[PDB]
């Protein structure tokens, strides 16, 4: 299947309480492998998955210097954003950056990303074609003119198609035993009465990887969206994920409703109904 | 213009005396670095700084320190200068294009003793009569000798102004004593005019050599004159004969 | 640049020809390359940057990059004398180190119309017992070797340009403090034209 690598970087100003806090994390698919925290003591990029540990000391120095420099760059970008938006020095603000690459089943480049949001709104982003920038507003346009003059688009494209893709292959091969694994979802159903006329059926998916999953309800094979509660997919904390979908049904009609589970580790989609004697 | 500023341009110091070379840049560049350049060894990075308070070693860091407290500055610090740090140093900076632009250069000589510093002696050699008769041309040779360190600029002056046509100077000084440790240096240059021009006793030729030596601040208690930064020249007049 | 085709010493091109400096880099993670020109004892000047595969052109320079072969190269059209310099290229590390490859010394040689190779003795203007020897007017073909004797100095070759006379010439200098030293034998250890003019030291 296809794979990704992403770094998610967050700068948060805290005026009166020191320099902005900077946190960056790296992920391969749904698995974290590095972090950096400006408040942490080590002042280093740090391992967060077993397979990145085989990286020599040169790797840690290199990554450390790059991400430190970036913290300072985004620190600066926060100052510049204040000026552009004539915002006050005593208010707290956020700057997020996200970038990374996708490769397909073959391991060839597929998609690249390089994006920023300021206070949780798109500021500037590299388009999908990696050739130009989409600027949200007047401010981001000044930024765009600068980056066009310094060919950042061409540089970051070279990075996204090259180093990023090469990085991802190396990580995938090194973490082979866990990153190439697909744990199929373990399933079951629960019944909630609520009222004598109407009962809740909850459909469980447990211990699956990767996170991507689809839970869907069907009454008499009909795509249900009335009375269909869907929760966010959650981490279990062991590298697996969980999710449930729930339907409120008229009573006695349990046996006519059905839950459908699609996941990468299920060759055939699973069909579920209340089944055993009960209701 | 729009480049880095290195201070000083030239420097002689004794082994062990702490020194620091400044590098500043008012272009708001995030990236600054120091390089040395040595015959046979290429241009190599010493230390580089990708942003404020971020600092990493190059391929030749040992014996050097840096700091990056503000954006505009990147000093190169030598705690205990050693003879192997005798070299040509460049500072460089870059912004978003990631292209590094290089400062003008600091020539640093680390010497065992200031008593080893000498100004150049300079002599002009007159064109050979044989040559004028054979080629109807006439070449003067300048020789600067006995100078240490090799911190010199040679130039030719005719009739009060500097000339460039018919000139060529050695790229590199020679060592007078390839054996000796702080061997003194020699440099050569030629100026070639027509026979007729040389044969005119109205024409006046000077070979000028700027030497960079001990500053005002250096202690000197020796018989011979303090080998300060100075100019030494040699002249010739045209001759009919 | 330190491989099977490691850049080796100088490169000379006929004036007016196209210069081709093709270099190999080892690290497959190299992405951005920067060409610099450095004149002897001067600062490296940026001439060309290249961020992706292919060719880039500014006036007479073409910067080339082939990420497959791992070749980075520079082409100089219509070589001029003033193009003579060292040419350096640099790339970034995974840590933001800039690493320079093997530099290339480029000497653009002009053809010597009428080489009149000769050795002359020149007398000092004041202290006339001192003198130098001048090997001048040789072709671009001849090579000046350093001396056998340690007490005799010989300088490398050097070209001068008498602009207004459309005349260029080569020269090297030799001198020595030894009493028995003579111009006649100053260049003994060099391979010099059979035809080299050696006149009695002075004169006419």
């Amino acid at each position: 299947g296809s794979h990704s690598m992403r770094y998610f970087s967050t700068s948060v100003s805290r005026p009166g309480r020191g320099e902005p806090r900077f946190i960056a994390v790296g992920y391969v698919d749904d698995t974290q492998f590095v972090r950096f925290d400006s408040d942490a003591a080590s002042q280093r990029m740090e391992p967060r998955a077993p397979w990145i540990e085989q990286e020599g000391p040169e790797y840690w120095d290199e990554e450390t210097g790059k991400v430190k420099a970036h913290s300072q760059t985004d620190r600066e970008n926060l100052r510049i954003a204040l000026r552009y938006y004539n915002q006050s020095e005593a208010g707290s603000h956020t700057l997020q950056m996200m970038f990374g690459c996708d490769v397909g089943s073959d391991g060839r480049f597929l998609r690249g990303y390089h994006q920023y949001a300021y206070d949780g709104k798109d500021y500037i982003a590299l388009k999908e074609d990696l050739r130009s920038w989409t600027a949200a507003d007047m401010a981001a346009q000044i930024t765009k003119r600068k980056w066009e003059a310094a060919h950042v688009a061409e540089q970051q494209r070279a990075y996204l198609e090259g180093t990023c893709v090469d990085g991802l292959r190396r990580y995938l091969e090194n973490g082979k035993e866990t990153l190439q694994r697909t744990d199929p979802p373990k399933t079951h159903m629960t019944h909630h009465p609520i009222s004598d006329h109407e009962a809740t059926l909850r459909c469980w998916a447990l211990g699956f990887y990767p996170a991507e999953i689809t839970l869907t309800w069907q009454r008499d094979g009909e795509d249900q969206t009335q009375d269909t509660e869907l929760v966010e997919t959650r981490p279990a904390g062991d590298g697996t994920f969980q999710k449930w979908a729930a339907v409120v049904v008229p009573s006695g009609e349990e046996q006519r409703y059905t839950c459908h589970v699609q996941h990468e580790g299920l060759p055939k989609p699973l069909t579920l109904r209340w089944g055993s004697l009960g209701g | 213009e729009a480049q880095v500023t290195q201070n000083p341009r030239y420097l002689i110091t004794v082994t062990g005396k702490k020194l620091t070379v400044t590098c500043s840049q008012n272009m708001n560049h995030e990236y600054m670095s120091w390089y040395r350049q040595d015959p046979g060894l290429g241009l190599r990075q010493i230390y580089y700084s990708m942003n404020v308070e971020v600092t990493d070693k190059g391929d030749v860091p040992e014996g050097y320190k840096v700091s990056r407290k503000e954006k505009r500055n990147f000093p190169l610090i030598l705690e205990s200068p050693s003879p192997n740090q005798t070299s040509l140093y460049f500072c460089a900076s870059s912004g978003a294009s990631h292209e590094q632009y290089f400062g003008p250069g600091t020539r640093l000589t680390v010497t065992e003793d200031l008593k080893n510093v000498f100004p150049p002696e300079v002599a002009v050699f007159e064109p050979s009569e044989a040559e004028i008769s054979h080629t109807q041309k006439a070449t003067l040779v300048c020789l600067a000798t006995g100078f240490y360190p090799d911190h010199v600029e040679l130039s030719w002056w005719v009739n009060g102004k500097e000339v460039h046509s018919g000139v060529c100077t050695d790229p590199q000084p020679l060592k007078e004593q390839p054996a000796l440790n702080d061997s003194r240096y020699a440099l050569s240059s030629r100026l070639r005019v027509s026979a007729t021009f040389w044969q005119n006793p109205r024409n006046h030729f000077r070979c000028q050599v700027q030497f960079y030596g001990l500053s005002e601040n250096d202690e000197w208690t020796q018989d011979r004159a303090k080998p300060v930064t100075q100019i030494v020249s040699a002249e010739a007049w045209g001759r009919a004969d | 640049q330190k491989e099977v085709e490691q850049n080796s010493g100088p490169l000379s091109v006929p004036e007016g020809a196209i210069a081709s400096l093709n270099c190999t880099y080892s690290d497959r993670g190299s992405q951005s390359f920067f060409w610099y020109r450095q004149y002897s004892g001067k600062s490296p000047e940026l001439i060309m940057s290249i961020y992706s595969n292919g060719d880039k052109e500014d006036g007479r320079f073409t910067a080339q990059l082939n990420k497959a072969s791992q070749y980075v190269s520079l082409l100089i059209r219509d070589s001029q004398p003033s193009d003579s310099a060292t040419y350096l290229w640099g790339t970034y590390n995974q840590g933001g180190k800039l690493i320079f490859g093997q530099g290339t010394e480029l000497s653009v040689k002009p053809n010597i119309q009428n080489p009149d190779p000769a050795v002359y003795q020149l007398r000092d203007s004041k202290s006339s017992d001192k003198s130098v020897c001048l090997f001048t007017d040789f072709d671009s073909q001849t090579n000046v070797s350093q001396s056998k004797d340690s007490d005799v100095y010989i300088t490398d070759k050097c070209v001068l340009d008498m602009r207004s006379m459309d005349f260029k010439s080569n020269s090297a200098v030799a001198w020595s403090n030894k009493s028995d030293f003579a111009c006649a034998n100053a260049f003994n250890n060099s391979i010099i034209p059979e035809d080299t003019f050696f006149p009695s030291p002075e004169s006419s």
Binding site: Y7, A24, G26, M45, E62, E63, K66, V67, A69, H70, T73, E76, N77, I80, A81, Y84, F99, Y123, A139, I142, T143, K146, W147, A150, V152, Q156, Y159, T163, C164, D166, G167 | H29, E30, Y31, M50, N51, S94, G95, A96, S97, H98 | Y92, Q94, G96
Partner: peptide
């Protein structure tokens, strides 16, 4: 591997 982003300022 993290990208070299120096000088990429707003």
């Amino acid at each position: 591997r993290f990208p070299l982003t120096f000088g990429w300022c707003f």
